[PDB]
Amino acid sequence: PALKYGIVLDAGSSHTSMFVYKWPADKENDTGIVGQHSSCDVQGGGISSYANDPSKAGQSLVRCLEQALRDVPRDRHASTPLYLGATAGMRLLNLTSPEATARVLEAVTQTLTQYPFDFRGARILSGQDEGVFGWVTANYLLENFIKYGWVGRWIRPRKGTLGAMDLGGASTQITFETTSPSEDPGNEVHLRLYGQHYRVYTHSFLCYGRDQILLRLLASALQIHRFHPCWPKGYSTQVLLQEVYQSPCTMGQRAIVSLSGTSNATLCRDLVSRLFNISSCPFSQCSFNGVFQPPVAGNFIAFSAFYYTVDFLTTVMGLPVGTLKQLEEATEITCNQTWTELQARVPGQKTRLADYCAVAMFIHQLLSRGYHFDERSFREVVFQKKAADTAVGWALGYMLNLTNLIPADLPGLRKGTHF
Numbered sequence: 001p002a003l004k005y006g007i008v009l010d011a012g013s014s015h016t017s018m019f020v021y022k023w024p025a026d027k028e029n030d031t032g033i034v035g036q037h038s039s040c041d042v043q044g045g046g047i048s049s050y051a052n053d054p055s056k057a058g059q060s061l062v063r064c065l066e067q068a069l070r071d072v073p074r075d076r077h078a079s080t081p082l083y084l085g086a087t088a089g090m091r092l093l094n095l096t097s098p099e100a101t102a103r104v105l106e107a108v109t110q111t112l113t114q115y116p117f118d119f120r121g122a123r124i125l126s127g128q129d130e131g132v133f134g135w136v137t138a139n140y141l142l143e144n145f146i147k148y149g150w151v152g153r154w155i156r157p158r159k160g161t162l163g164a165m166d167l168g169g170a171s172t173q174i175t176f177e178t179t180s181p182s183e184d185p186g187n188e189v190h191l192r193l194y195g196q197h198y199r200v201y202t203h204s205f206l207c208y209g210r211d212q213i214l215l216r217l218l219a220s221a222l223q224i225h226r227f228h229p230c231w232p233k234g235y236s237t238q239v240l241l242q243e244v245y246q247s248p249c250t251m252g253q254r255a256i257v258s259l260s261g262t263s264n265a266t267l268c269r270d271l272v273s274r275l276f277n278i279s280s281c282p283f284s285q286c287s288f289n290g291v292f293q294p295p296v297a298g299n300f301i302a303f304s305a306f307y308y309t310v311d312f313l314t315t316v317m318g319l320p321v322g323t324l325k326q327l328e329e330a331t332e333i334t335c336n337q338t339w340t341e342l343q344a345r346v347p348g349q350k351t352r353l354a355d356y357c358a359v360a361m362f363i364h365q366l367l368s369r370g371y372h373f374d375e376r377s378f379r380e381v382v383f384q385k386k387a388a389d390t391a392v393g394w395a396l397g398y399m400l401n402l403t404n405l406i407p408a409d410l411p412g413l414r415k416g417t418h419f
Ligand SMILES: Nc1ncnc2c1ncn2[C@@H]1O[C@H](COP(=O)(O)O)[C@@H](O)[C@H]1O
Pocket: 012, 014, 015, 167, 168, 169, 210, 211, 304, 305, 308, 309, 352
């Protein structure tokens, strides 16, 4: 079996990752056939972090691109497509400066074009793209697009699909198949995949990614309390105010100030609750901030920082998260830890440690009060970051779309046997 390869650079707000995928040439249109071959994490910040030094953005890719040259056989370099897709870090920079955004894209394009891969462009994905391609990735990998059964006995209803929830650094996405009528065209997605129609809801909440929420909570704590109730008692840091308020996500709030934590789970809950506006809804039903959302339904996979945060609660804190009530309890216990108590649980590097309480509280509120999961619907959510040896994110679905590897219809319409 002769193999083909494809590469996606996922240029996220907080960092870039490279994924190399491989598939058999003769089976390339089968669902689930493409899988991850290798990956590489680019050292340092996201490409948007080089807004004032755009030349560095291209150079930042060099070491991982050098790895791609070793990972993909030489004779196949020329015919291996390479894409770069950038998400909310670049969407935010584009609000601030379309010129600086264009210079970054120019710098990554110049670097990528120097390599022997078939470079197919650097683009900024829409929030819809990001949500939908993640949903496609999960369902493709798990073979949910297969028509199950056989002639005269098809499973009915059709095999369910897995909803997707992605918590990145700068935005968060929710995407799932729905039978509810569409009320907002911006949220409505129709896919034709392997002869089947999927009616899908998606939304991306810009500024509701992990890093931006943490900045917004810090801005809020500074204004309301002058201490940080989500940070652990005994933890303090010198906050440079310029960095706090420079983001599009925090400009709305408002040189160095000392800020200390207080382990106040109840005040932390109150601070997080200010992130969700539930006061108004121009639709029949909303999530929050007046965004249309039908009832959540079916199974979901929650990946990226949902997975990393829950993994911390289960593996480091040793707490169950099987129910919303358990997640709330685990958040409380975590937020009530002092800095010495929390450090005692983590023998190694301590980066991100002071932030788990806030992120866990955010996640719990986002799911329960934002998306309106309840105990029944939450039981259907799993936290995982990989399926079939492949990282779950939008990259695979993006590559499948741009390489035209998912057919709208089966060959010869399968003689019409799925009609
Ligand atoms: N081990 C971790 N614990 C908590 N957050 C993380 C971890 N690894 C990455 N993150 C954060 O998760 C967010 C999305 O990460 P990613 O989906 O890997 O780009 C970013 O804010 C990252 O800093």
